[PDB]
Amino acid sequence: AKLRVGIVFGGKSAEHEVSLQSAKNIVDAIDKTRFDVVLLGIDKAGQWHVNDAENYLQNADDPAHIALRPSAISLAQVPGKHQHQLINAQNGQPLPTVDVIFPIVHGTLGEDGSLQGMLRVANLPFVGSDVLSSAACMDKDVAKRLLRDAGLNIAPFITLTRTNRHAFSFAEVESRLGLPLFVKPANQGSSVGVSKVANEAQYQQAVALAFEFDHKVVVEQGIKGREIECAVLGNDNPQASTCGEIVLNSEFKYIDDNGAQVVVPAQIPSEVNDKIRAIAIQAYQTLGCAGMARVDVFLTADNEVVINEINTLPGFTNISMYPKLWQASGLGYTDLISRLIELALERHTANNALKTT
Amino acid sequence: AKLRVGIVFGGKSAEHEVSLQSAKNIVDAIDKTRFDVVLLGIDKAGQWHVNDAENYLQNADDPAHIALRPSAISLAQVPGKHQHQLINAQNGQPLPTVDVIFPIVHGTLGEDGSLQGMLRVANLPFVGSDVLSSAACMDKDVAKRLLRDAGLNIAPFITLTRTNRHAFSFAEVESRLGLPLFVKPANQGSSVGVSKVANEAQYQQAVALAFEFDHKVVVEQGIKGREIECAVLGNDNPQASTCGEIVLAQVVVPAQIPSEVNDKIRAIAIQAYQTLGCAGMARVDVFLTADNEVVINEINTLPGFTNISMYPKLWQASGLGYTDLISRLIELALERHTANNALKTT
Numbered sequence: 087a088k089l090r091v092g093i094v095f096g097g098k099s100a101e102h103e104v105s106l107q108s109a110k111n112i113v114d115a116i117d118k119t120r121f122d123v124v125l126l127g128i129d130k131a132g133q134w135h136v137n138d139a140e141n142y143l144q145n146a147d148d149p150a151h152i153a154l155r156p157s158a159i160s161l162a163q164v165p166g167k168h169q170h171q172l173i174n175a176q177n178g179q180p181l182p183t184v185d186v187i188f189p190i191v192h193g194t195l196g197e198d199g200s201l202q203g204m205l206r207v208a209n210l211p212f213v214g215s216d217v218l219s220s221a222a223c224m225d226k227d228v229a230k231r232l233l234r235d236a237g238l239n240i241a242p243f244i245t246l247t248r249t250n251r252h253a254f255s256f257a258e259v260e261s262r263l264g265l266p267l268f269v270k271p272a273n274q275g276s277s278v279g280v281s282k283v284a285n286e287a288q289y290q291q292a293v294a295l296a297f298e299f300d301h302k303v304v305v306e307q308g309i310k311g312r313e314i315e316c317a318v319l320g321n322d323n324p325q326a327s328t329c330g331e332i333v334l335n336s337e338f339k340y341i342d343d344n345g346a347q348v349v350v351p352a353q354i355p356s357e358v359n360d361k362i363r364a365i366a367i368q369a370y371q372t373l374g375c376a377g378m379a380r381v382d383v384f385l386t387a388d389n390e391v392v393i394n395e396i397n398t399l400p401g402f403t404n405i406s407m408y409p410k411l412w413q414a415s416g417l418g419y420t421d422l423i424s425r426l427i428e429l430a431l432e433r434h435t436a437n438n439a440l441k442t443t
Numbered sequence: 444a445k446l447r448v449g450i451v452f453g454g455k456s457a458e459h460e461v462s463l464q465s466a467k468n469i470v471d472a473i474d475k476t477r478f479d480v481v482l483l484g485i486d487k488a489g490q491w492h493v494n495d496a497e498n499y500l501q502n503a504d505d506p507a508h509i510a511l512r513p514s515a516i517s518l519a520q521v522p523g524k525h526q527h528q529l530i531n532a533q534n535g536q537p538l539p540t541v542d543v544i545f546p547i548v549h550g551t552l553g554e555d556g557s558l559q560g561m562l563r564v565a566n567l568p569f570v571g572s573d574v575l576s577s578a579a580c581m582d583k584d585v586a587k588r589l590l591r592d593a594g595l596n597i598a599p600f601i602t603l604t605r606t607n608r609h610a611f612s613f614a615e616v617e618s619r620l621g622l623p624l625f626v627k628p629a630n631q632g633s634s635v636g637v638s639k640v641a642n643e644a645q646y647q648q649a650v651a652l653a654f655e656f657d658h659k660v661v662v663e664q665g666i667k668g669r670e671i672e673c674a675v676l677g678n679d680n681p682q683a684s685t686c687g688e689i690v691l692a693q694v695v696v697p698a699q700i701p702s703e704v705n706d707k708i709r710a711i712a713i714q715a716y717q718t719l720g721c722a723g724m725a726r727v728d729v730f731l732t733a734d735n736e737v738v739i740n741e742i743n744t745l746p747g748f749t750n751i752s753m754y755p756k757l758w759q760a761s762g763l764g765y766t767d768l769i770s771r772l773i774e775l776a777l778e779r780h781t782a783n784n785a786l787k788t789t
């Protein structure tokens with residue numbers, strides 16, 4: 087009568103350590119009365135394990151050194167099964183059935199649709215956005231094209247590929263987008279490969295760097311404003327939390343938000359707050375998100391709202407923006423976790439009922 | 444020692460039998476001197492198996508009744524491993540490692556990014572388009588919005604969700620899009636759940652029907668023109684085959700059109716291919732209007748692959764034989780895997 091909730095955390099990605107911290111806080115917050123938790127830790131090599139709750143983290147208190155305890159047992163997943171989809175990879179021994187997955191592996195694989203495809207194949211219900219949406223929110227070029235097509239405000243930009251890379255002189259790009267410019271790989275996290283550009287030397291350097299991480303590089307016009315974030319929750323009826331502010335400076339990744347200044351709620355007028363909330367929901371809908379997402383925007387001096395990013399699996403530590411925003415909007419961590427689980431099971435039921443032939 | 448090619452086929456999809464046929468044809472033609480095939484058949488319940496090439500199909504010679512021979516071994520995948528990713532799901536025994544996967548599961552799961560996601564995590568090189576592109580080409584709504592954003596022509600359309608489906612009345616849709624209309628689930632294959640609509644009754648029926656297959660429904664203006672198809676092959680510098688036509692049941696190859704039109708459609712196929720980030724292959728289907736306007740109807744990332752299907756026929760009629768097409772697709776998968784592996788993570 088209690089649902090087994092498999093929390094999937096860690097991962098190959100550079101956000102591994104932040105993922106450990108999100109997981110730790112969910113394990114602590116989650117309502118024991120309704121849910122038994124199973125710890126599904128992914129090591130830095132990308133292999134899955136079942137961890138013991140008492141000793142699964144080493145140096146849990148210290149972000150720089152925190153690590154996932156090594157485990158004897160590796161997991162495999164069995165396509166098309168509806169029970170016991172997760173097994174011991176060494177000997178085929180089945181784990182007890184997991185009723186729902188809570189993925190909290192930030193960035194690569196976890197946030198880009200790959201994990202979601204795997205879970206879809208294993209008929210595992212899961213929290214958060216599905217394959218198309220996660221893949222699309224992770225490719226900044228694709229997400230911006232969809233946002234643009236929906237009539238929503240985004241930074242003016244161009245996308246460089248391996249084959250159109252040199253068709254653009256730095257002069258051409260400056261005449262298109264003015265200065266400064268930000269240059270970034272299309273698929274990335276946590277500001278890596280991201281550079282501010284004020285001249286031609288910087289631009290050329292910036293592009294070669296970003297092309298080390300992706301086959302597509304986004305170059306976009308610099309936007310002046312406050313960075314405001316908003317937490318969206320739901321499937322068919324998305325609800326927007328109050329907004330929060332993040333302050334990033336130019337002076338300087340195992341800490342969520344890279345240890346930047348975070349204030350909740352954003353010290354902005356409620357009318358602007360509501361305008362950003364409504365826009366965050368349109369963004370959510372345009373990108374086909376499910377379960378939750380965090381929408382990050384720029385607020386200019388004249389209160390124009392420019393969408394910067396949509397994150398489908400945001401930091402979920404006890405002090406991360408996404409949970410804090412809901413806590414400030416009347417929804418506590420525990421109830422948030424439960425709401426996300428409930429939404430995941432409803433969406434699973436909806437998908438399951440669809441005809442195949 | 445030859446590259447082991449894992450052919451993934453069948454699947455829990457309406458197009459199951461088609462897939463079975465596509466794989467039979469691939470197995471039959473693949474260059475046995477370069478490649479060892481391993482047959483990764485997926486039954487209709489969606490469970491994977493290893494099949495034997497000498498006896499894996501029942502009624503193989505009969506287009507209806509053709510089915511996958513039941514197998515003892517079911518299969519599991521081990522995330523994170525770079526070798527022996529596929530194991531006996533009962534006892535953990537690994538299969539010898541497969542060097543490349545040729546997915547040919549049409550439609551749901553196989554063609555919509557799910558399978559690709561699984562393969563990406565398993566570090567298995569694979570033929571055809573990757574996670575986002577496969578997912579985006581499968582969702583007609585997303586594919587159309589991307590094509591429109593690129594400045595390419597699509598059928599004017601509205602997209603219905605469970606929350607808005609009752610907002611638009613037949614009369615309002617009609618003023619917007621004219622008649623007749625085509626109503627389609629956003630994510631489906633080969634005309635499943637697709638209806639032509641000429642009046643209100645048909646409309647409500649069609650819409651209710653599409654909503655049994657997907658949570659999004661596309662309603663489009665009917666386009667008047669010839670149905671032309673074009674095969675696209677490659678990654679970074681894709682080539683377009685000559686065009687083929689579908690006639691009132693009859694497949695005509697090459698399509699009887701002026702060379703300028705052939706080349707105009709070809710260049711548009713390629714733009715659509717790039718816009719949607721397709722890799723390895725796709726078939727682009729268009730309407731060619733009476734005034735030579737080209738309207739993109741769809742992009743198939745895993746098109747039917749029988750030696751008689753359109754995609755392989757367009758290549759044959761362009762000078763590229765079926766065995767050789769298969770080999771080039773495998774090479775392309777490997778080239779892309781290697782290029783992806785050279786991207787830095789830090």
Ligand SMILES: Nc1ncnc2c1ncn2[C@@H]1O[C@H](COP(=O)(O)OP(=O)(O)O)[C@@H](O)[C@H]1O
Pocket residue numbers: 241268270274275276277278280306307308309310313334394395
């Ligand atoms: N167009 C822009 N205008 C102003 N600042 C930008 C722009 N693009 C990026 N930045 C700055 O760089 C930071 C990281 O960029 P972002 O696109 O969010 O990449 P990531 O996905 O790595 O977080 C932003 O939070 C913002 O401060």
Ligand SMILES: Nc1ncnc2c1ncn2[C@@H]1O[C@H](COP(=O)(O)OP(=O)(O)O)[C@@H](O)[C@H]1O
Pocket residue numbers: 598625627631632633634635637663664665666667670740741
């Ligand atoms: N908008 C349209 N205008 C004219 N004919 C259409 C339109 N949409 C579909 N058709 C006809 O219906 C057929 C099936 O529709 P299609 O979208 O190709 O289904 P699927 O994508 O599942 O193959 C098309 O090949 C074409 O003959």
Ligand SMILES: [Mg+2]
Pocket residue numbers: 276277382395
């Ligand atoms: Mg960001």
Ligand SMILES: [Mg+2]
Pocket residue numbers: 728741
């Ligand atoms: Mg078609």
